[PDB]
Amino acid sequence: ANIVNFTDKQFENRLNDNLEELIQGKKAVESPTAFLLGGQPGSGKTSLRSAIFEETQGNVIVIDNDTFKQQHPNFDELVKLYEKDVVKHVTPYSNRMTEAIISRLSDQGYNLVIEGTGRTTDVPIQTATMLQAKGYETKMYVMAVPKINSYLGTIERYETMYADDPMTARATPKQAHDIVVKNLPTNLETLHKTGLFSDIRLYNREGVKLYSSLETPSISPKETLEKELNRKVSGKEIQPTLERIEQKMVLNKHQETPEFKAIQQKLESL
Amino acid sequence: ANIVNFTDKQFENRLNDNLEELIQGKKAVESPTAFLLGGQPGSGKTSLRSAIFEETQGNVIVIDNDTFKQQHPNFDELVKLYEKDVVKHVTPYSNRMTEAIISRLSDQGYNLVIEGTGRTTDVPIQTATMLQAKGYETKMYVMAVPKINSYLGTIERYETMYADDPMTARATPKQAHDIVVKNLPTNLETLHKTGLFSDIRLYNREGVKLYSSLETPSISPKETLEKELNRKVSGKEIQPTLERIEQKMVLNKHQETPEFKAIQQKLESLQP
Amino acid sequence: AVTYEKTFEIEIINELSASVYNRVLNYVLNHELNKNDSQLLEVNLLNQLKLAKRVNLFDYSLEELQAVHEYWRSMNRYSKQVLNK
Amino acid sequence: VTYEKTFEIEIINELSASVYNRVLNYVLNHELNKNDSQLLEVNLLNQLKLAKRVNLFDYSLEELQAVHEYWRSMNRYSKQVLNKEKV
């Protein structure tokens, strides 16, 4: 409790600014649509945002839990006490802020994009059900990317953030990446069966639609996603990324890590 | 085609942005006042802006010719072509823009501060006469600063600007400074005689009003200004400035210059 | 119709800008500054960041995205100096 | 007002004019829609306009030094974003 806590007034002032920022250039509509995202960390879900922005001709609001963590009223004091381990202390705030925003924006009828990994089915089911009760159509757009490419992506994201700010940069546990990779295929089939989503789609990093339950109702998203996740990536396709990451790690003075050494071998092994 | 020239359209678009920028937060009034500034380069005339801002409760527009020099449409090309001697090539543009801005803003009736050195008597006379014909009260506020302090000011200014951008920094030719110091005292008396200015004031570096023709109409501004221009500055007073200049010149790697050698020599003699 | 290189730049920009914006917003709010007073150094900065964030990154070229990324790196550095006197 | 603050203000005004003018020149030369905040260079121009609306005479020396750094950073940043060529 104490400093990790905050007043309703502090919460309110932040909620109001968040709302002001998010609705800029946006307009509520009669039949709103909510797009729940999915895909393991590193897959590149930003590509899904592009496809949805296009579909809605720009009239859509993206709700990303992570963008509110450093907004905790006492973030500065919390950081001085916990430094790199501050994240766990402010997640509650971010979670509450995220739910407050979704609730307010869905009450008004804005088209929404909800950042997510699809690690579980209960979260998206809960969200979709709550939204449909408010008159929303709900879709689920998910990244379908080879596990090796998304894993390298988590590493590159970290090294890049590190280069920008060594203070707040923090790696994605490989366990967190692998758990989504392992459960996502089965989870999408489970979601397919609920019929809650008008359309469940799989996309690659270039925004190419690889699957659509609306288009192929009897085809499960499972096998198609698994195939992509386990697809063997050629050295020709992977070498460029390896070198790019390698160079960033050298700059960050991160050569003495299993990640750097593994990239060296996997690279020299070509 | 001569990069020194520019189209009336280019001038017009810049004039429009300038007006939009300058009137922002200001308002034209029924009986406007214009303040013509005076003082040699390095005399810290921005201090005058501060006093006038206070007097007008912030409702005043500052017109400064120098702020338009790099606004020349082909400034970049002119900089590579003429380099260090580029200023004289963009002055035609800046002079034209400055007069256009003064004309447009005075047509409306905004309170104005016109940056100037007071090198001449005729420019401010013509300016004030033109303004009065537009319903303006015209005043003249001038910096009264020892010639050693203003000279040092031009050096600190150059070295400081150089530190921010070597390509943007330009030294103040000593003649630009010395000529004003020489003309000003007499020029102010000549201006005082015209009766064009409701008030002619002299301010020191600290913002202290040293003279006001309005308060003492039978006293000439000349002697008071000459006394401060020629005032002998002590070892202290300039020491902090010399130290600031040294710090910048070391940073700028300008130690191998007469100025620097003079600064260190002086600073050494001022040590306990 | 997007590239991985650009969408990756956008992801990084979105995380960095959030951090910078939040830092300034937090200060303005814990300090009770009038958000409607652009004369205040921190509020003026907040308003500039608001203007910077209102853009659509999906309509920028790779070069422009790299520029936006540097913009936020610069504001990350600047905000720290302005807030931490 | 002090000479120290006055000098800081004089430098700020000179540097800001340099940076603003560079940006203004580019926007005008490239005929960019000044009312389109989506255009990267116009967005920057508008931020600079916002920066210039402040009354520096009301700032402390510390606030002025921060403003001075602002213009140094925008001086650096503008040189990078003003990438497109042409007359």
CATH of the domain at C13: 1.10.8.130
Q: Which residue does chain A place closest to C83, by CA atoms?
A: A76
Q: Which residues contact A42 (CB under 8 A, 6 or more apart)?
A: A145, A149, A150, A151, A152, A153, A154, A155, A157, A172, A177
Structurally, chain B folds into a number of domains equal to 1
**Chains that contact D by 3+ CB pairs under 8 Å?**
B, C
Cα distance from D60 to chain C (closest Cα, Å)?
A: 10
C-alpha C10/C-alpha B264 separation (Å) is 52
Residue B113 lies in domain? 1-272
Q: Say if residue B118 carries a ligand binding annotation.
A: no
Identify how the structure was determined: X-ray
N-to-C CA span, chain D:
44
Among the listed residues A21, A49, A20, the one whose alpha carbon sits nearest the alpha carbon of residue A36: A49
CA-to-CA dists, residue B264 to B150, B243, B257, angstroms: 19, 9, 11
Name the DSSP class of B121.
Answer: S
B164 catalytic residue (yes or no) = no
End-to-end CA distance of chain C: 45
A207 annotated ligand-binding residue: no
Q: Specify the amino acid at residue B102.
A: I
A27 neighbors A111 (Cβ within 8 angstroms): no
Count how many residues are written for chain B: 272
Closest CA to A154 of A269, A38, A39, A36: A39
| D83 vs C contacts (CB less than 8 Å) | 63, 67
Cα C29 to Cα A146: distance, rounded to the nearest angstrom? 43
Domain that holds residue D55: 1-87
Asked if the Cβ–Cβ distance from A70 to C18 is below 8 Å, we say: yes
Question: D55: which chain C residues are within 8 Å (Cβ-Cβ)?
Answer: 39
Angle at A150 between CA A145 and CA A152, to 5 degrees: 145
Strands A209-212 and A200-203: antiparallel
- Cβ contacts of A6 within 8 Å, gap of 6 or more: A72, A73, A74, A93
Q: What is the largest CA-CA distance in chain D?
A: 45
CATH of the domain at B216: 3.40.50.300
Report the candidate in A10, A17, A5, A203 with the shortest Cα–Cα distance to residue A101: A17
Strands (E), chain D: none
